[PDB]
Amino acid sequence: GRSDAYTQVDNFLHAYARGGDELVNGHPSYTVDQAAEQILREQASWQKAPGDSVLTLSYSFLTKPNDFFNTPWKYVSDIYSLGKFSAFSAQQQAQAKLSLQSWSDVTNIHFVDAGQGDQGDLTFGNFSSSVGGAAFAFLPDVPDALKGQSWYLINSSYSANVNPANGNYGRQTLTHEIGHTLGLSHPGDYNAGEGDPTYADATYAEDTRAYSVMSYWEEQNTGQDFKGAYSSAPLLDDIAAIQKLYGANLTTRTGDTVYGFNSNTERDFYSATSSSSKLVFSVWDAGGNDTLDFSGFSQNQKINLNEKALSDVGGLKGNVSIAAGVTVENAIGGSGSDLLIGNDVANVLKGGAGNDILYGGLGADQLWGGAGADTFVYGDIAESSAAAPDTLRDFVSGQDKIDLSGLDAFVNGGLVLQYVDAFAGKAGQAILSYDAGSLAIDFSGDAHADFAINLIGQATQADIVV
Template sequence: MANVVFTEKASGGDAHMTFGNYSGGQDGAAAFAYLPGTGAGYDGTSWYLINSSYTQNKNPDLNNYGRQTLTHEIGHTLGLAHPGDYNAGEGNPSYKDASYGQDTRGYSVMSYWSESNTSQNFSKGGVEAYSSGPLMDDIAAIQKLYGANYSTRAGDTTYGFNSNTGRDFYSASSSSDKLVFSVWDGGGNDTLDFSGFTQNQKINLNEASFSDVGGMVGNVSIAQGVTVENAIGGSGNDLLIGNNAANVLKGGAGNDIIYGAGGADQLWGGSGSDTFVFAASTDSKPGAADQIMDFVSGLDKIDLTGITKGAGLHFVNAFTGAAGDAILTTSGGVSTLSVDFSGHGVADFLVSTVGQAAVSDIVA
């Protein structure tokens, strides 16, 4: 995610990082590290407590505290400080010492404070999950120091189920898995695949946004400057939120709400009663219209109330120049809804459905 390359060597180099362990002392600290520029023999070194009574660092496995500790201390050796002016070796700091509200482990592995302070929840099955990789604010900070690396996952990448990232913290294989990560992606056509989860989820594809995935809250985020094109929901009642790219959004089973936003999107509700939401006429316009790929009349709905504000539509055979005129046509099993919201006598909103739609399916 940054222009840093790690190469294992015995010694030497201008930016050598050394890892060590200790069994006691250091005022009971679980780990500590030295920032660059501390001094010869110190900078680039990090130390980890390992003894019979403290074993977290001995096995820094996925989602455990030892893995987060390792990531945190590596952050220090690369030049990242805590988000605020506090340190475990200086007094008894608390969240009151935070310099800004987002100084939590929901935004940064460099923080001391629980994600609950920012209304997030990384607990599942009574077990707290910790991030094993850099989070949203860490990515921004390390890129400010070293520059953003756009060759990282520059191809078509899938995160979650069916992951091809080669990273355990970006991957899921079971509904019981706990995902805590922030996406940095250099390009390609990318997908958040949370199809294996049964809980109700919120999946948001916008940069600098958070998603509620697999029964947790605010546990998946997308870093600033990243475009993820596609999302796949699970078997719960999911909310899928697109961005201004041409998204492919698949709700899966359950009664889903799908909002494509800008771009020419392909939308699948899946089984269940699904609602396709449009908040602005520009969300689906002639020349860049959305397609609802599996519409079932009587079960699914097209919700335009975000545009009409409850004023309704006037279904006509031809536009009259009145704002709110709508034409619904069907040919070969495909319905097309055209609406003149501006009152110029031509459609400024258009959406098509694979599967015949009826006037009663449109909420305005």
């Protein structure tokens, strides 16, 4: 029967499932694309005039009240006095630029610094008298006198916007409000200051802060846990939504990029600095050989290298994801007992310390167990072909395990392995060799190998689980 090691792989491959024909939390479950469409329901966007396919938008930080601040009721209904005006502080301006950068990273927009004043296509400013919310912005379908404007609440009762920083609510709010100015809405028909909106009023299940920064609702609603942290940058569904409007940015991080620990992203939200770092990000990456490095964590982690998939990283749940259309090649686990699932291409998987379960998937994968009793799992024959097999780079006999219990020939076929020196034309015959080693199995029974695994360090029959 199927081993527990295989079961854990299969369960995490289908973890945080979306789509499907059943109601989730009393809502229909949406795919990433369906969620993106709903986010863009207002059909609001900036029109490309200087050049198509690439948009250029200027931004500035107001130094004095504008015409809208002075008399809001002349322009908008149900907004009267915004209180005291204050310019964006030095910290606010630097964090706004990082929020702006995180948007331009993922889509074809170039943000130009227009300095201090009312110059920019997008403007930023603080207000003190709340209109039911912590901040507000206008979508780009409004008249020119309001287009691009975002406003943020600062008073003695609300201080979240005063000191924005990586992982806090002040930063997310900035990313959220700029999202509005670019043309994104809340994933549901709800608004702060209007009645009593809850997660029950969402249009779809994946309307949480695990999938979109435009959402009001906490990640716990869809089974995630960020332990108090907020996403600083666009999440899975945000990326899909904004790319529908202004395209995918295929110039971003085209070289070999490391995410998590030892990061070369130069992005605070993509980077881990200590064993306590609370990571929340969705990877947008245009090309190259890329690595998820979570070696500095001690907790038991679950890492999924497939696109659109969510991972459990550094004591958090469903906090790391990979954007649609992104290929990430490599994963490095921490000192805890980790689960590492690869994707369709060639993957380098490193477990590190602890008892790790590695699943290369399709392609010829380089699998490092590290210290401890590690399990290398196979669910399909095509995952390690005789012509292009996996390599187990640090296999230790009597400690590590080759798991084949999930294979169709064992679960349903009822096949028993016969270890031999030559294939006589029988199903299940296996040749185990050593010099460096190799395991080659003839599952069909045509005297030719259809499944193989390359070995660095010898393996025995006892190291193979069926």
